[PDB]
């Protein structure tokens, strides 16, 4: 029931300096660390209250690892350029996501290590944490190099080890927020768009985590073809927002019900305007 994920992005930019490296870390839907090589003074930095207590050896060590990783990813951009026979005048992007999922008992459910080059799958570690999926011939080169160098074995040792253990630590230190679901505050609004139709918009605000279902029914039947659903969006205070809307004949509003499923909710909600 929990996860830790790191997201690295490396972006070349010929004419605009060396490639930029950005890392962010999440536990579940909470960002807790950041690094940006373009900062006036680049350091791994806290982004959630509960990580701030980590001592100087954590921050100094994470900062050194990020600086090393930036350099390595700059090298890998140069290598990818050669694999793909691309020009040094073009801008390219490596994105890498890795981390671990744990169960309620705090043990490893699944480990992750996958990447993209210019927004297409490049190479991913498989669920066995022993093999790779390469998406093209360039990644097939990488795949052979990594088998020869026991890279999957190294990842596996991190993912089964430190990843799981530090996730456990963070979850304890930030238990008050990370292991507490915040149910949505919900309401329905009504907006006339003519003398014959109106919009019914079902709101969900201030919820955590991000996962939620909002649906509209008419006479107890799913209106999925006719519902305007917006992408779940950050409120900016670590909680999320979503709404769902339907256009209904003026006067027939009571035929419509909005249904809300969220983890922080003891029971699903049924709302009507």
């Amino acid at each position: 029931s929990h996860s830790m994920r790191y997201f690295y992005t490396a972006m070349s930019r010929p004419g605009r300096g060396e490639p930029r490296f950005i890392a962010v870390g999440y536990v579940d839907d909470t960002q807790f660390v950041r690094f940006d090589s373009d900062a006036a003074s680049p350091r791994m930095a806290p982004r959630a209250p509960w990580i701030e207590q980590e001592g100087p050896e954590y921050w100094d060590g994470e900062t050194r690892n990020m600086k090393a990783s930036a350099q390595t990813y700059r090298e890998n951009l140069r290598i990818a350029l050669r694999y793909y026979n691309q020009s040094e005048a073009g801008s390219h992007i490596i994105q890498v996501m890795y981390g671990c999922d744990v169960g309620p008992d705090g043990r490893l459910l699944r480990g992750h290590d996958q990447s993209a080059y210019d927004g297409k799958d490049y190479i991913a570690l498989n669920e066995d944490l022993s093999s790779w999926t390469a998406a093209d011939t360039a990644a097939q080169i990488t795949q052979r190099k990594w088998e020869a160098a026991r890279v999957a074995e190294q990842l596996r040792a991190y993912l089964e080890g430190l990843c799981v253990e530090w996730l456990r630590r963070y979850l304890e230190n930030g238990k008050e927020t990370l292991q507490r679901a915040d149910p949505p505050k919900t309401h329905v609004t009504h907006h006339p768009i003519s003398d014959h139709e109106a919009t019914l918009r079902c709101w969900a605000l201030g919820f955590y985590p991000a996962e939620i279902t909002l649906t509209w029914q008419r006479d107890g039947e799913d209106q999925t073809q006719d519902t305007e659903l917006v992408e779940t969006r950050p409120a900016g205070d670590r909680t999320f927002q979503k709404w769902a809307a339907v256009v209904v004949p003026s006067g027939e509003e009571q035929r419509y019900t909005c249904h809300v499923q969220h983890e922080g909710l003891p029971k699903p909600l049924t709302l009507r305007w």
């Binding site: 690892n65 990020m66 090393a68 990783s69 390595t72 190099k145």
Partner: peptide
């Protein structure tokens, strides 16, 4: 915590 592993593609 992040991994220290450094690999070339």
């Amino acid at each position: 915590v992040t991994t220290d592993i450094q690999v070339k593609v």
